[PDB]
Amino acid sequence: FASRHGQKGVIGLIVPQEDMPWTESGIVPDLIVNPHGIPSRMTVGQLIEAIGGKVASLKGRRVDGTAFIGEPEEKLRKELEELGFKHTGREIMYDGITGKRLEADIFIGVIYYQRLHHMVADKIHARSRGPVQVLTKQPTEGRAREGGLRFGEMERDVLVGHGAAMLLIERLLEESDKTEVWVCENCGHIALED
Amino acid sequence: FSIFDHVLVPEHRVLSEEEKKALLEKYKITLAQLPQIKASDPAVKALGAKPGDVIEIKRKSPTAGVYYYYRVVVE
Amino acid sequence: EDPKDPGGYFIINGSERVIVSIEDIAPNRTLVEKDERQEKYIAKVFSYRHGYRALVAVERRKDGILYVDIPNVPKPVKFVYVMRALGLERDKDIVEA
Amino acid sequence: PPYNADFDGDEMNLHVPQTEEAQAEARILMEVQNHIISPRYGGPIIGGIQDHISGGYLLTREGAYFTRDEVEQMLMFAGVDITELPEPDKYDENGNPLWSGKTIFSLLLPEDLTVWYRNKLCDEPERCEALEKLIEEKLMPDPEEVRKLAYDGFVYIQNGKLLSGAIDKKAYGREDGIILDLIVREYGVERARQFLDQVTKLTIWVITHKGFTTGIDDEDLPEEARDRIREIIREAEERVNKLIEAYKRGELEPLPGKSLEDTLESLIMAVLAEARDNAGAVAEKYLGMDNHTVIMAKTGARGKILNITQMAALLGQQSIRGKRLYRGFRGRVLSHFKPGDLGARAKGFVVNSYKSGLTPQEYFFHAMGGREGLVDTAVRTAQSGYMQRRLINALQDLKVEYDGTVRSPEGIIVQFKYGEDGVDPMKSWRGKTVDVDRIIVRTLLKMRG
Amino acid sequence: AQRLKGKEGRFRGNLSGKRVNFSARTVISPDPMISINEVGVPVEVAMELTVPEKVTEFNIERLRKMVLNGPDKYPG
Amino acid sequence: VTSPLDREQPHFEARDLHGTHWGRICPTETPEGPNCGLVKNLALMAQI
Amino acid sequence: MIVPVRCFTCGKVIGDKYYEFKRRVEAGEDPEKVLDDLGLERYCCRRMLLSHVELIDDIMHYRVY
Amino acid sequence: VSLSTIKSLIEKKGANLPENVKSELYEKLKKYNEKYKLTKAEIEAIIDDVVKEYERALVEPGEPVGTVAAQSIGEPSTQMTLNTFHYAGVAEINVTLGLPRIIEIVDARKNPSTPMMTVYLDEEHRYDRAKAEEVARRIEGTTLENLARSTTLDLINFEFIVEIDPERLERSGLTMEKVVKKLESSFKSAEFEVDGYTLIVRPKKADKISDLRRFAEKIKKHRLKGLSGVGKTIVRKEGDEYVIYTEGSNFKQVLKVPGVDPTRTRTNNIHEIAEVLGIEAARNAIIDEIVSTMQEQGLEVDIRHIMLVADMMTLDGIVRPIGRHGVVGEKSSVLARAAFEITVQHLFEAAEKGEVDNLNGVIENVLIGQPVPVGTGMVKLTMKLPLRPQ
Amino acid sequence: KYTRFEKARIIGARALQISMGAPVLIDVPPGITPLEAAILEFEKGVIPITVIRP
Amino acid sequence: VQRIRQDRRSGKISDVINVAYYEDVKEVYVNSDDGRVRRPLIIVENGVPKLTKEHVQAVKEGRLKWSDLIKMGIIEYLDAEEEENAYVAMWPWEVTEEHTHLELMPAAILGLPASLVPYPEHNAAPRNTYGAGMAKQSLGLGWANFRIRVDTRGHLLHYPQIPLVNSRIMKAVGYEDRPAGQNFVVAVLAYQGYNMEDAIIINKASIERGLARSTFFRTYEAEEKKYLGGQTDKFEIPDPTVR
Ligand SMILES: [Mg+2]
Ligand SMILES: [Zn+2]
Ligand SMILES: [Zn+2]
Structure with a gap:
């Protein structure tokens, strides 16, 4: 008001x-x-x-x-x-x-x-798992498509300043994107799994 | 006039071999891991030093009355 | 329609488009500014014809010699040279102009 | 204050850690009560704001007294686990008992706290000097001797009993907090959290049930004050006119290094600033302590004296980028003035107050003034952000090793002792490595007891 | 070259920062009745966000009760 | 009325309220963020 | 869009008194005297009649079925 | 108790305290003992309490002090002003302030926008106003155009003509025959006609139609006396000692000027102090400049963060900027530099050199997705396996 | 003695061990969460994990 | 310039022509182009305004219009160039022989939303800017056509009211026919901790009686596209078979 x-x-x-x-x-x-x-x-x-x-x-x-x-x-x-x-x-x-x-x-x-016209009924937004973007395999953008909130690099610097390494890794890997790959230690190139 | 009388310039002195080795041992550091001071620095000229030498600096910081900072001479 | 509606907008594919007014520099105006970076004086004009714009400038460098900048010209030409190119070759004609 | 948030439409995000180690890190490192003291300057960042300070002043001011029901209700509301009221401070007519605000406030302090200082309400230094002398001569004065010399400008606490002074931003406000700073250091974070909750609730109840408001009459100056202000303004304008007349005939003395025009401008601005300060001097002196706006300003809860002197007496000179207004027509700002006029009014000096109303020229000049502040904030935010990003990328990976040295990831030693004394600024006693006076004083009062 | 540069590029847009799950955003309102280390959470958000918990011998009954409550009662 | 300049630059001279704006551009109705001073609205007396 | 039934603050029903007030005030009678005649003592009610604007009559022209 | 016993006690069990702490404790104890009679046990307990507070106030190993310092500098920077003051006040010289000054200091600009020096007089002329004015006159420098009341580029006979102002003479005790003497000494084959508040120049080349104005400006711009680069000077009194403030900057020459106290003269140009006095003096100057700039704005920032910044910048024996061409550019990690700015150039340069990134930092580890080596990320744990419940 | 980083790391390890199936070394009130169980074990002094320092 | 001014005021030439002279450089500028921003002013001649009481009476009765006043040489438009030579008085009672023009209405220098704020000269400029900006965001009966409008988003205040304290300009511009707010009985008091830091406290009973109650609209769109090759969409109940 x-x-x-x-x-x-x-x-x-x-x-x-x-x-x-x-x-x-x-x-x-x-x-x-x-x-x-x-x-x-x-x-x-x-x-x-x-x-x-x-x-x-x-x-x-x-x-x-x-x-x-x-x-x-x-x-x-x-x-x-x-x-x-x-x-x-x-x-x-x-x-x-x-x-x-x-x-x-x-x-x-x-x-x-x-x-x-700034009513809380249009601003509240929460995402449990939602869908993910095709390319980066990360949460979508915006309320309309069940997107996730942006976790900016300034927030990462704040986390580092608090010294919370495990909280940082939790926020940055499991909640957004993570995967397992095959690496050939002989030449460093990523191996192929058939 | 010597630069060492200026309030901005702390007292420099040359460490001989024994204290140099003791300092290198107490921090478990090689000589390459120390802060560098140029051989062209006016303090190096006034005091007199050669590359590879270690200078002890007595600073007058407000937090601690005396503080010791060390620099390695490099050309 | 609403009688209070003032109109004055466009309807494109069902959406209401309004054109805002751009605030440009007055055309065909000789504005003089100081190029203190190179210690010069510059006059600028924007000549309009059939919508095309051409920024033409005449400047005095530290040497006290005038040079004219023309669109599609790599380096500024001599003022007297370009004036000669437009006829009026007489030196007295330059001084009187 | 830590979030820099106000409830005018701000949105804030929430995150839920999903793993037990992350939850443990959040629970141990990131608890709010851990970060009461700011690492930037070693002072409190969490503290009472606005109504907390105002209610504290209302509760602890001289002459404040409360009845049985008020005391019981406010203590229950604050959450204090009291089961027996203390002895009444005074007896009202009709035999009703009354309790002073000092006694009620003292029930929230730790039982053995002792401190004295000067707050922002100090106005008669002799009163504070007498109390300081009495405390200095013997480190434990008689409470019945202090209560005779009690003065609102000098806070003094003896074994948890508040004997003099009034609550102020110095008591528990974030910037100047001392009681909170002492508590968090001498009793741990949990006691500080309990104290903060209790004082906030108590002050909120006090300000709710005592009544606190501001109105259109808070700037109603008496006629003599208006006459004095008009006299000051006229004298300043006459001085400016005399200076301009002297300049126009080459009789002005050129100040060193400056052009004559610049000397004239600087002298005019000095005169105008002096005039505004002089008007504010009487505007402050005619509005007493009984005005709620003056209470809000003096205690530091909200606003400052400049707002009062602008609303009641005089807006003063309006300027852009440190110089008087000149960006109008040739030789004049507005077409309503004659060209070449250098008078104070014609260049931006506004003689009216917000209460009395602004003439259209004054209104336009004020808008000119405000636009500069708007654009200044707009550009300054981005510039500060970019500079901070550069600093963060430069200094990100430095850390304190187990041996006390600060080392680059490549092993290069940056400092042989962090901060050259080894003390964390957050844990420092307001920049100082250790507060010797406080330790000596508290030890002496502990043992002399 | 464009993908790897800029604020929206890979390095600064998808590596140093990214969008995360289990997050919520809404406006704030004052509440002086809660402790300084507490935040009021809408019941709508609470039933949307979840905290995975392992079943142990000291919390079996509470988890069983919540599972009985289903995904519609508040403590479910 | 919208200025064609770039929003990101400071442009302290262009964002300022010129003295000739009296009666031609509103002195107060302006945006809040980076567009402050670059987007302006005609006054009521204005005629084009 | 139409006159409210009760005053927002106190709750007194003033929905029936709007047309009477408008007619009498149009006729020439003093608005304060008309309000006092209607019995609206507290200014919370008088605000509702004084500031109301009838806007149902110009939206009825558009129908949706 | 005696003061010697107190002194012995302080150094006996408080031996771990910093030196300023041991001296301050002695001073405070001496002050308090005379007013209130202190017992031996009280002194011992006070010393033990001080030692305990110092022990509990030490920094925790693994603390990421660098990020905290960066944030403690950046955060107040959103509260400083931009327009500064822009007022002269006779005794003050206009200089950049606020956020732009901090940006200048951090970026370590080779030449600051408003160079300024603070010159302290030696014991002689320090307290006398007239003698201080004389020393300022020695320091102050001017050229020919400044002395001119008016200038005349006479064209009928092609001679330079200058009109001279008495005030520019009297500012320094300079007189016209002195100006003429320097004119004759510094040039040859020029008329330099001596006239009352008038001077005429007409060499053979300027006598003709081509070489008047160009040589005229060269004559007009010559300095007869004064230190180079010092455009202006102002004298004012601080406490009971008079000091001199100057426009422009030349730190090399001022230390040799007679009457100047060389042990206390400063300049706001860091790259001058670095060349004249060394790297440590530059570090101290940077610290003092940042402290003064942030203090003038009313903001409170602990000195320790500024020490960290200054020590980081003054590390390779030079004064490097914080940014692309400085500390960030010196980082060994390829990915750390790439994420900051100009990513493609850094990537291709690393490809050329075959650079190796050891992932020893924070940014690279965050990019990979493995714990950073700060805070809880550096702690290592062990346990004895055969755990039996109690 | 303990830095807050060490305390947080120890508690985080103990909570994960308890959640994965390790027995609790002290009696706890019913309905408690594993993180609170680890915190209880900690302030009670029963910690089987030690920290390595150079 | 006097010769051209006489013709412009008499009616010999179009009103869009503006003429100004610069004494120092001895230059005369004549402007007749497109896109200049001008303001009307009353012509003051020999210390007497050309606008008289009977002209006001004729305007009130509808006999005389604004364009007639323009053509009668009483009011002329001044662009920036011509205003350089002018000397305009603010109020009729401060006009003297030096003045060349008289301000029509000083209160009209403000924009349209900025005119909404009552007594704007008693507020600091930033607050007036915030109020003018926020005046474009509030809900209300924007248009009587809203029911059949197909806007993507829309709003409708249930009981809009005319402001009790208002500027006379808003009635003229037609804002009062489409109000966008309500009158509240406001008490300035620190009722609790629930209104600190710019929070406000509202009564439940008034809300239940229809205070600030609003309705939100949103329009969805669906096309039955026709693809190349004859395939097309179709409106129907989706069978369980379809993916
Ligand atoms: Mg806000
Ligand atoms: Zn391979
Ligand atoms: Zn009512």
């Missing part, structure tokens, strides 16, 4: 409704986001849109958010106070588990969010 201010993420947990905290005015959040990404990302526009959405939904008409001529922040803050809420956009909530109000006032608003 991603907002239009560049903030993106994945669903980490699905919470039952009675566990979610509720504002003392009767609002239950549809979504909860971490307050930690906001200062680093420096997306103040999302914080302004949060106020603007609730102001629009409370006054009954949409709010213009044009680039350089949209409704200023100070107008929205005063209008929110006019409607009976606090100008900071902070409301008192009660904890959904212990049933008692949180110590700090919580910023809550309405934000436009978009569902992206």
